[model samples]
Target chain A: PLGSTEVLCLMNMVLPEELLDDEEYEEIVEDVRDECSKYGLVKSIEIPRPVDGVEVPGCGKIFVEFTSVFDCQKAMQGLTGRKFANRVVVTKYCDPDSYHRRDFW
Target chain B: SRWNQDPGMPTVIPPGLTREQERAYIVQLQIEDLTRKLRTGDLGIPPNPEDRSPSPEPIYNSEGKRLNTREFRTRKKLEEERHNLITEMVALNPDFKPPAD
Candidate 1:
């Protein structure tokens, strides 16, 4: 088991409503993406949001899939203690398979 | 390979510079990042170790309590980085007081 993963899960960084408003969501996504790009290549980013009659599992969590484990670890190490939107940033390595399945916990 | 490619740091090493100079450059970059985030209000208003509102998961678990937890460790890590950064910045220019512009 290597200490590497392709997906980095961010917590306590974003607020629920901040990610709900489409415009705000877009702006923050750009901010997050820009920050991550500094570490390495980011394949895709997902910030779950609410739906009228749907259950969003990871409403306020941030999921960034990087090009490789190297990039993900760089992001994880860099972001873990950082602050954003007036909240401290915490993160963990996620299961790439589940991430690919769109199942965020 | 001799560059400071650490996370949250610049990857490009200047064409000509000693190891110490390279470190100083990276330290300056780190300071700039901290200063910019502070000015832009991106850093937290007042970081609280006890506060864990926005996180969907726990910052700490039963294996630890109080200060030994992840929240404290994470907070401490940032604080240490700032201190280490200032230590270098001061060595370069004693006139500069750190953690601020």
Candidate 2:
């Protein structure tokens, strides 16, 4: 068993092509936060902004920081590979910067 | 820091002066402060003794002979060293910290 302070979160959410608007983007963030609160506490939800002025296609990236990594882990286990508002989400926490930095693209 | 003492680039000057005159005066003062800082090692970037713009073709001097390969190698080594130092600094001091385990 892990300590209460430790929580592991798996957090890769992809937005549907049609739902890439700012309104929908915010909706997904709200949904994630509401869902996580039902099960555990969320510390913060990080939505990375455009570096310059260029907007890349796809769902804007987000990171949900939980008070305990355990809550994050639970969220991952429960939500990984699950469909949320039509988009299939991927779960895993390693190399978060890769998505934001365009290294993967 | 003595750098703070150099009368900072004036944010505003008395009216009736030409904008060009005001700008030139402020720039001159800033350049003087900057040069003093440079002499004291307060301002600098790693130096490259030769051009480093990426090139697929070999470079040559006025004599048209190939440039020294050793200089290129040294530049590459310095670049790698700088990169490693940056990586070390980031790993030791990332912005986010996970909850204590």
Candidate 3:
């Protein structure tokens, strides 16, 4: 359990496939991590790996957690409809149950 | 044709026909005046609070395990502050408005 923050959001990003080289993966992670830090404390950044249990070949997925529900709200307002690498980032308020229940479906 | 003289037709159409066409065709039209008022930006009545209800319990982070109550309080306060900041930002923007004059 992180904190009892009422608001948490998920942002889905699509980066250029070429951007996935090992040299830049950590940079991509840090970019998002830093963005979250601007609004409030970030609990974690969960990047999804591949079906084979290896990290996704490219910069596949990222999830950011904030310390407060308000910070999540502000982040949603400021970040949705924003661009990264010329691609629009899609953001949505995440339901905690739905987040961890990926295997349920 | 007699059909033209039938009661089905009205003598005069309200202005902004395209906007009101849907209403003109309804069997018994209501809210026509309300529409007119809205078009003129004369929303005489206040918005319904029940329809808008306070913002929903944020769906974000619903799955995260609950933190200690103290931490929850701190986070909630931060959230309130953030909400206020966003509201102020939007208010400062003069050009934004609900779509459709």
Candidate 4:
């Protein structure tokens, strides 16, 4: 369970709509992980899968957990407003408890 | 007209001022405006389209009842304000660019 202080939520990162295959998803995940890891020690990364019948605000969003709060803060500052995949990134500190419980509405 | 009440506030930059003085005055005004926004958090970080959403549930106490903590509520209010500003800015400027640094 990652602490909230150690997690950074990144948004506005929607993968290419043409990437419909599982292999594409895997490739993007690895790509994002590798890119983010360059900034800090990334403990884990979570990307919510799209559900047909459910509404998730955080869908297609990326949540990255670092080993420490300082690392998380650094990642948030460095990633916010940065462009990736031709889109600007929005980053914020995640509420650890709510995120752990999957309480993102 | 109301601004004329303040003597220190130059209305016309005075006719005798040199070109360098006029340039410095204009730059000073620009800096002041920027500083004001920076200090008040008005110049917030840009928001991603996907990140904009309705407010989440408020924090609760141990019993699961909503807790009206001042700090939490104030922070939420500020966040909401910033989000709204960013959304408005994005709408106004579709080709918005983020700061270099």
TM-scores for the candidates: 0.50, 0.36, 0.39, 0.46
DockQ of candidate 2 against the true complex: 0.01
Query: Over the stretch A42-95, how does candidate 2's per-residue lDDT look in tens digits?
Result: 766655444434564322444566766567667766665454432234443433
The lDDT values for all models are 0.65, 0.45, 0.45, 0.55
Per-residue CA lDDT of model 1 for B1-101, tens digit only, reads: 00012254433333456546645765676565555555453443335645434544445457664435444544554566667777767768746555453
Candidate 3 chain B: worst-modelled 10 consecutive residues by lDDT: B1-10
Label model 4 with its docking quality class.
incorrect
Cα TM-score of candidate 4? 0.46
User: By descending TM-score, how would the candidates be arranged?
Assistant: 1, 4, 3, 2
> Which residue segments of model 3 deviate by more than 4 Å?
A1-12, A15-20, A51-59, A98-105, B1-101
A13-87, model 3: which lDDT tens digit per residue?
433343446656666768777777789687666665434444443234456667767887787666755545432
The docking quality of candidate 1, as DockQ, is 0.04
State the lDDT of candidate 4 residue by residue for B19-62, as single tens digits.
34543443333333334444564432334435333455688889
Chain A TM-scores of all predicted models: 0.91, 0.60, 0.68, 0.80
Worst 10 residues of 2 chain B by lDDT: B1-10
Best by TM-score: 1
Which prediction has the highest lDDT against the true structure? Answer: 1
Model 1, span A1-104: residue lDDT tens: 12467988776565465666787778888888888889967999998887734757876678999999888887878776665754445566777888889987
Docking class of 3: incorrect
